[PDB]
Scaffold this active site. Structure first.
Site, PDB file in Angstrom:
ATOM      1  N   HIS A 205       0.845  -1.053   0.116  1.00 57.66           N
ATOM      2  CA  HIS A 205       0.079   0.056   0.070  1.00 57.66           C
ATOM      3  C   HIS A 205       0.875   1.287   0.049  1.00 57.66           C
ATOM      4  O   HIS A 205       0.506   2.404  -0.389  1.00 57.66           O
ATOM      5  CB  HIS A 205      -1.061  -0.187   1.102  1.00 57.66           C
ATOM      6  CG  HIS A 205      -0.603   0.468   2.392  1.00 57.66           C
ATOM      7  ND1 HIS A 205      -0.253  -0.445   3.544  1.00 57.66           N
ATOM      8  CD2 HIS A 205      -0.545   1.710   3.145  1.00 57.66           C
ATOM      9  CE1 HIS A 205      -0.075   0.328   4.636  1.00 57.66           C
ATOM     10  NE2 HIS A 205      -0.201   1.570   4.243  1.00 57.66           N
TER      11      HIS A 205
ATOM     12  N   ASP B 288      -0.680  -7.365   1.606  1.00 61.78           N
ATOM     13  CA  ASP B 288      -0.008  -6.108   1.689  1.00 61.78           C
ATOM     14  C   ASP B 288       1.426  -6.510   2.004  1.00 61.78           C
ATOM     15  O   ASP B 288       1.899  -5.993   3.211  1.00 61.78           O
ATOM     16  CB  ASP B 288      -0.745  -5.413   2.986  1.00 61.78           C
ATOM     17  CG  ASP B 288      -0.093  -3.793   2.916  1.00 61.78           C
ATOM     18  OD1 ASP B 288       0.217  -3.209   1.926  1.00 61.78           O
ATOM     19  OD2 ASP B 288      -0.569  -3.039   3.700  1.00 61.78           O
TER      20      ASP B 288
ATOM     21  N   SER C 261       3.643   2.289   8.516  1.00 64.64           N
ATOM     22  CA  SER C 261       3.525   1.307   7.676  1.00 64.64           C
ATOM     23  C   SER C 261       4.635   0.599   6.898  1.00 64.64           C
ATOM     24  O   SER C 261       5.576   1.527   6.402  1.00 64.64           O
ATOM     25  CB  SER C 261       2.506   1.534   6.539  1.00 64.64           C
ATOM     26  OG  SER C 261       1.057   1.739   7.170  1.00 64.64           O
TER      27      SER C 261
HETATM   28  P1  LIG Z   1       0.643   3.036   7.247  1.00 57.78           P
HETATM   29  O1  LIG Z   1       1.441   4.203   7.884  1.00 57.78           O
HETATM   30  O2  LIG Z   1       0.308   3.635   5.940  1.00 57.78           O
HETATM   31  C1  LIG Z   1      -0.819   2.624   8.184  1.00 57.78           C
HETATM   32  C2  LIG Z   1      -0.545   2.223   9.390  1.00 57.78           C
HETATM   33  C3  LIG Z   1      -1.669   2.204  10.388  1.00 57.78           C
HETATM   34  C4  LIG Z   1      -1.216   1.466  11.933  1.00 57.78           C
HETATM   35  C5  LIG Z   1      -2.346   1.638  12.685  1.00 57.78           C
HETATM   36  N1  LIG Z   1      -2.064   0.826  13.903  1.00 57.78           N
HETATM   37  N2  LIG Z   1      -1.519   2.073   7.595  1.00 57.78           N
HETATM   38  C6  LIG Z   1      -2.818   2.351   7.116  1.00 57.78           C
HETATM   39  O3  LIG Z   1      -2.906   3.794   7.173  1.00 57.78           O
HETATM   40  C7  LIG Z   1      -3.601   1.611   6.404  1.00 57.78           C
HETATM   41  C8  LIG Z   1      -3.337   1.398   4.937  1.00 57.78           C
HETATM   42  C9  LIG Z   1      -4.290   2.363   4.457  1.00 57.78           C
HETATM   43  C10 LIG Z   1      -5.788   1.928   5.334  1.00 57.78           C
HETATM   44  N3  LIG Z   1      -4.803   1.862   6.320  1.00 57.78           N
HETATM   45  C11 LIG Z   1      -5.787   2.185   7.607  1.00 57.78           C
HETATM   46  O4  LIG Z   1      -5.060   1.502   8.480  1.00 57.78           O
HETATM   47  C12 LIG Z   1      -6.987   2.799   7.775  1.00 57.78           C
HETATM   48  N4  LIG Z   1      -7.820   1.946   8.818  1.00 57.78           N
HETATM   49  C13 LIG Z   1      -8.467   0.661   8.198  1.00 57.78           C
HETATM   50  O5  LIG Z   1      -8.703   0.365   6.929  1.00 57.78           O
HETATM   51  C14 LIG Z   1      -9.502  -0.142   9.251  1.00 57.78           C
HETATM   52  C15 LIG Z   1     -10.475   0.972   9.917  1.00 57.78           C
HETATM   53  C16 LIG Z   1     -11.178   0.292  10.958  1.00 57.78           C
HETATM   54  O6  LIG Z   1     -11.546  -1.036  10.914  1.00 57.78           O
HETATM   55  O7  LIG Z   1     -11.619   0.920  11.583  1.00 57.78           O
HETATM   56  C17 LIG Z   1      -7.311   4.069   8.227  1.00 57.78           C
HETATM   57  C18 LIG Z   1      -6.375   4.488   9.695  1.00 57.78           C
HETATM   58  C19 LIG Z   1      -6.750   5.221   6.954  1.00 57.78           C
END
Ligand SMILES: *P(=O)(O)[C@H](CCCCN)NC(=O)[C@@H]1CCCN1C(=O)[C@@H](NC(=O)CCC(=O)O)C(C)C
Length: 224
Positions: free
Chosen positions: A44, A88, A181
């Protein structure tokens, strides 16, 4: 990283900082060196142009231990699903090999099909934000506890215990966050996971890609 501590400088020489697309600040991720010419990170985090920084502690300064190399190729897993955020994982072939030293060297990967017992303490590190309000210029880290698959299985719809790992005790304010990430999850000094996603709140448990499930794809991509 939420609830962590600043890492001792240069103590995790496999850590990579990724600058994705121009201008300088389009998007950022972490990653880890698995061979002198390959970096493993999250799919991603894909971008048209990626600048990899190795040997860093403070990413906002020109440190002499740092090595900047652009990714020659960004190979996303062929079955990467952006919608469910499944598979991922991505390999970055560097335009040139890193010059290996005490500050820059590969991390050990696990053996294939190698599982992980719930309750195991693992370390995750990165340059991501520490809260909704502030970030960090330097590398941090935190210890997270592995959860039963059963636990994420009822929280995240697309969770797959065979390819992912459920991490983090909900009772503690410790987790990876925005910008972490692609960073490694080191369990017993072996890179078992890759930071992928979780609740927007940062409230555990979150989901990591399980590295041992992709070894054959990893070995084939780097060999070929
Ligand atoms: P990475 O820095 O891009 C990030 C790390 C998140 C760590 C959380 N403990 N990951 C990230 O933003 C991923 C990739 C894009 C979508 N991600 C998100 O995590 C999104 N969350 C989910 O889809 C789940 C949401 C939920 O079930 O409540 C959001 C945070 C953008």
């Amino acid at each position: 990283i939420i609830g962590g501590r600043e890492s001792r400088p240069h103590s995790r020489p496999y850590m990579a900082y990724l600058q994705i697309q121009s201008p300088a600040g389009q998007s950022r991720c972490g990653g880890f060196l698995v061979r002198e010419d390959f970096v493993l990170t999250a799919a991603h985090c894909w971008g048209s142009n990626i600048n990899v920084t190795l040997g860093a502690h403070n990413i906002q300064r020109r440190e002499n231990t740092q090595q900047h190399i652009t990714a020659r190729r960004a190979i996303r897993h062929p079955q990467y699903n952006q919608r469910t955020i499944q598979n991922d994982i991505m390999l970055l072939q560097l335009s040139r090999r890193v010059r290996r030293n005490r500050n820059v060297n590969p991390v050990a990967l696990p053996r294939a099909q190698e599982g992980l017992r719930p309750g195991t303490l693992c370390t995750v590190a990165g340059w991501g934000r520490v809260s909704m309000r502030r970030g960090t210029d330097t590398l941090r880290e935190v210890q997270l506890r592995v959860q039963r698959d059963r636990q994420c299985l009822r929280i995240f719809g697309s969770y797959d215990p065979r390819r992912q790992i459920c991490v983090g005790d909900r009772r503690e304010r410790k987790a990876a966050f925005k910008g972490d990430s692609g960073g490694p999850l080191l369990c017993n000094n072996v890179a078992h996971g890759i930071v992928s996603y979780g609740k927007s709140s940062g409230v555990p448990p979150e989901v990591f890609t399980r590295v041992s499930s992709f070894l054959p794809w990893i070995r084939t991509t780097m060999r070929s």
